[PDB]
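FAQ: What does a ligand-bound record look like?

Like this one, built around S-Lenalidomide:
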Amino acid sequence: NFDTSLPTSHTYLGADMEEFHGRTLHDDDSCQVIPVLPQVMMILIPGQTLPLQLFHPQEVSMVRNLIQKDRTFAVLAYSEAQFGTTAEIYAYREEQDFGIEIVKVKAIGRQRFKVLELRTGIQQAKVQILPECVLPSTMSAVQLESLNKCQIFPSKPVSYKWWQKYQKRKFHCANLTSWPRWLYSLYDAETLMDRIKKQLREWDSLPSNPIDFSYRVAACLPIDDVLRIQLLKIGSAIQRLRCELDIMNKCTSLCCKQCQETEITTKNEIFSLSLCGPMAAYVNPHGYVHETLTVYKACNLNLIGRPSTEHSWFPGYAWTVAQCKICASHIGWKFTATKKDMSPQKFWGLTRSALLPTIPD
Amino acid sequence: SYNYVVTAQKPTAVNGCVTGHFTSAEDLNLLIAKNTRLEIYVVTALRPVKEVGMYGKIAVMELFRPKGESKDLLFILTAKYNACILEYKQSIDIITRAHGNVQDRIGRPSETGIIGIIDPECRMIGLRLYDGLFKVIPLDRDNKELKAFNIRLEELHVIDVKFLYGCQAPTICFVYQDPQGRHVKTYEVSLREKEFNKGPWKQNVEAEASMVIAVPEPFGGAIIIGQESITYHNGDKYLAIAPPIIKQSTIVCHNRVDPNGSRYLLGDMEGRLFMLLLEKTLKDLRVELLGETSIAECLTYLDNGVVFVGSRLGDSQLVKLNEQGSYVVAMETFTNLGPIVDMCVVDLEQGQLVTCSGAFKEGSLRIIRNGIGIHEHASIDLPGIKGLWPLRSDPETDDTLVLSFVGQTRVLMLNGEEVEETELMGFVDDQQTFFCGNVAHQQLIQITSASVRLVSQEPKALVSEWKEPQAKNISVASCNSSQVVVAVGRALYYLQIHPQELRQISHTEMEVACLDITPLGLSPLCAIGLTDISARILKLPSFELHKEMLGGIIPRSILMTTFESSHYLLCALGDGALFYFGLNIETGLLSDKKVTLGTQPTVLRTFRSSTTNVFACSDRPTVIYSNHKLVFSNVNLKEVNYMCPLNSDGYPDSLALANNSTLTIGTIDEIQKLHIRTVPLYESPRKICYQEVSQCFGVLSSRIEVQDTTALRPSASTQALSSSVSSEEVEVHNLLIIDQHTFEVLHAHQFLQNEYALSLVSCKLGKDPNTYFIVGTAMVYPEEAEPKQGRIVVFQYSDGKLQTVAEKEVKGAVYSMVEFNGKLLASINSTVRLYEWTTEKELRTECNHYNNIMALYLKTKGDFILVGDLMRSVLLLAYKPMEGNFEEIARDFNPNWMSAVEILDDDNFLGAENAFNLFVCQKDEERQHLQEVGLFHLGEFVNVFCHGSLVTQGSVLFGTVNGMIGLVTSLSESWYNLLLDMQNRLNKVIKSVGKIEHSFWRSFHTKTEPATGFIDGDLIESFLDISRPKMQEVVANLQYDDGKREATADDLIKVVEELTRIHWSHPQFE
Ligand SMILES: Nc1cccc2c1CN([C@H]1CCC(=O)NC1=O)C2=O
Ligand SMILES: [Zn+2]
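The answer part, i.e. the structure of the complex:
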């Protein structure tokens, strides 16, 4: 095998970046005016990491000044745009060697917002912060006071009766309400997270806070720009986790987005080469961003040009352009090992914008 | 949209219960919390003394005595973190010594909930609200604002905490859990440093230990209750028992019996009451099983071995604990409607409410009617009674009851409480009697069909007789103290009463079904009822008319009577109608005013209860009054054919009631009240609906059986007359068929093993004349998180049997069902599905709608459908008849736990949502967006809404976890504006217990926002109780509405009173 922490540290971007201890948040429902960077297209998720490479003096100004000292710009989901996410710069290097100015930055998604107005070649967006909606348990409202003492349980051994036990003791006071234990169970952050864990385990810990967890798996899920806007629209951790379980059951195959009815890969094949997941965002040399998904097998693709390690997002591997056999539409890349001792000798990296999740039959 | 929320039944379930010396140092009090209410009793060998209402859910309530104080003070903490210290004052005030809001800006509320504790030396209140922190309020005389400070806790998951006794400083003892397990620790609170100090001792306790008990100051130390073990600690002494007798369940409440701490009471999760004993210094522990009580939430030992068992799941109790080995026995029961888990209304057209109340062994049906009750003292088996008269065998008080049957009369003598049938000399007993009673000149009178008999008193004899000149059959009679007016079919005669003689005076003729001559000594006025169908008035001696006409069935009863000092005439119809006209004492003209009471013909009698009221017999018996307007008021009895007043040496100011097979003698309640009938089921009722043609209710219910599979006790569902089947604890679901009159369990159907019954409905479908019970089920497996299969079962109850008329398998859970224009509308998982009912007698899917949300809630008006889920997402849908299809109209995703929804009207939706709130969504392109037009912090968890009528526009009732019943109704914008002013001005004037601002209380809470579009009728109605100068203070700047003007106290007094009349009145506490 190879070092799984390497892809998330974006080593292909260069040697070293000055780091900033990020602590600026805007309070809920507020109206903020934030810069929007040109030619950035992606739907960015809170906690997700975003690397960039800037060449236009336009861009290079926006950031140079951003560094002092908000460090945050706005990323938009394009339908143009109804919603988006604040991204805060946590690392930055400014190379002007050969007299050519490049700015490389690593930002992280922070807050979800609703677009009010969009003014202008740099954009500034009028933006209302959407609150992260945090709810107690379903039972904390109807819970008998006498049974409060039992709400903490002995912790789970590192085994399924424990969950039957958990369900029986935590949701006991359902009897006071008009629904069963097993219903309240389907809105229980702790349960849902566990059900999601097991699926994510087949791609082999992680956050314990439901908000974080729900945002971490949100960024892993290979879905399409129209479905990504949906979860982004979602304000609740619970509804995020739920909806996320839905996709993981309902979306087994992955097809060419362009010619639509053509299978590239399946759930079975998805694996986390990156520590972060089966999917992360990566910049190419011209500054374009790709959320690429690592799979073992991929069908109906043609390979053109020569395997190359040039600017490779996976140190140790060379990339070859892969495209849909039918439509010729560029679906992603095949990665091959350069050492005969490395595990995965090949894997496919598929760009998310090129795919369409399908529920077969 | 603008709504009025008012309570119709205050919360009945007990939150907490404390004793101590509060009223006086001498008194011993029991203090009982019922959510937002606080009842104060004095213990005796319980006298209610004072009840008050917080603007707050009572979450902590302790008694304590500060140094150099003469009686205990009371600490309350509300769920909104309103603290206060309260004092009783003798008419009676509860005063606020101290108060303040102990909330923190930061702070994750602890999983184990709020915990309030006061140390033994009354130095401080210790508050555990959040993980990591321990809040301390010093009890210094000069801390009126309850300002406080926090101490950091290394331990983040504390299960339970108490201060200990007998320490050289205030000391907390607590059980906490971390990665290595569960442990007890102690900390010393350094008063000077304001910080924790290394405690006296600490100790890995039982895995499931959860209850801390601080033992008083001989032994001191702490007791720890767990799942299998009870353990004692102090310094480094240590005692551990693990008796079998506590194996079976979980100890969840406790209380100290005596100061010594020798004995403790312990309450199971399942009804068991234990006694724990400390054996003596301290050498051992022993548990004893006292027996079964209501499932206890809280226990208090009072005195003379009497114990208060505060229940939430059932009725609360008083239990007497009585060699022969320890036992406990029930003394008293106190009504709990708590968990109102579902309800329905019978007689929407009286009007009674039926609930599914309680849980496990406490499960019951509650039947709730408003009305005047009757205490019965005696019953006599005599079939066929057709008249009742009180009478007086001797010149003081009645002692004779005369009853008539078809062509027969019988006389009953009364000696105290013993009734003996006798003969009255002078009274013929072979005819049916039309009137008899006491008359003028020391005499007695019997008016039969044949003749009219004047009888003397001392040696009783027939002194004078009167019969028709042609010896004909009398059709109707009427007589008062001194006059007689008898009708003979075609014409009628006027007669008088003088000593020894009754001689005629008038001999008229008619163009007659009832008469009256009640004087308002001699009445110069006469009431008549004639194919001419009119209530005619006639002059005495003269007979020469006023009149009125009624049109349409012949009138049965007529009466002239006086309410207040106004005069009326009453005429009751043979179809069940009642007409009430205004009268003219000297003139004779009549005016105005009608009401129906029940199709069986009505009979009217006078009685005194200082003034005069009228009893009306029919299918529904009714008392009438009054305040210069007249009032309907139902009597809590099944039909009574006849009544009369009875005042005896044995039955003073009492009543005699006769129906078809029984005569009853009873006293009659002065005020109305709520009459609750309880049908214990000994299992959890889950749904109810009312099938009128089968005259019975369907009730979904479940019971808990334990593995090899068998029940824990006899249940409704195991003790039905007939029963059918479909063929570690488990759940067994049934449909019960409960008879509507006798509340017998007529039938129990039992669903499939692991089949969960979720929804129920009674209805007609398509072109089928039958009414069906229709259950929605779901298949519940432990391995399977998401429901993947379920049934819709269509049952029919004919004869004594439940038949299965049809099934429909469905690829998921049937959460909800509503009958929808003769079709069946069912929500299955995340689909909403509409079914047609064919002639093949099968449910055949017409259409189907998938949503982003699991269709938990379904409600309909006309063609509109409201779809909702646990998470508070609502969808408005429209069935399109020409499309055979659904259409989403509006939608609103706004994430909060939601517990119940209802449609108010085409454009407005009511909902209950997290932290005991109510909200209202309004319909009015991108106007598929619903607007939030009303919020209100209710203070209850609503389970069920239903359209109803208790007796403002429309009416929605709600039932609640704490057992409170509420009412919601619409107000015009004009009234909302008026009442909003009023609330604010009433807020300036009314003293609130913990000095909590009404505004803060009603503010929508989770986030916090002000209340809106809701009027607290509970607050408005208190306007009536403030002083006359305060009433005028409040109405100083209010615009009333006619055609507007400065409102007066009297305009408001009558406005608020009309308002009190739309729900049941509250009972006085004392
Ligand atoms: N050279 C070139 C020119 C235009 C686009 C792109 C490239 C290389 N590249 C990707 C290829 C896969 C990788 O591992 N790193 C990259 O940077 C592109 O997306
Ligand atoms: Zn293609």
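Follow-up question: can I read anything off the structure? Yes, for example: The pocket of S-Lenalidomide (ligand 1) is lined by residues A 284-286, 311-313, 319, 333 (CB under 6 Å).
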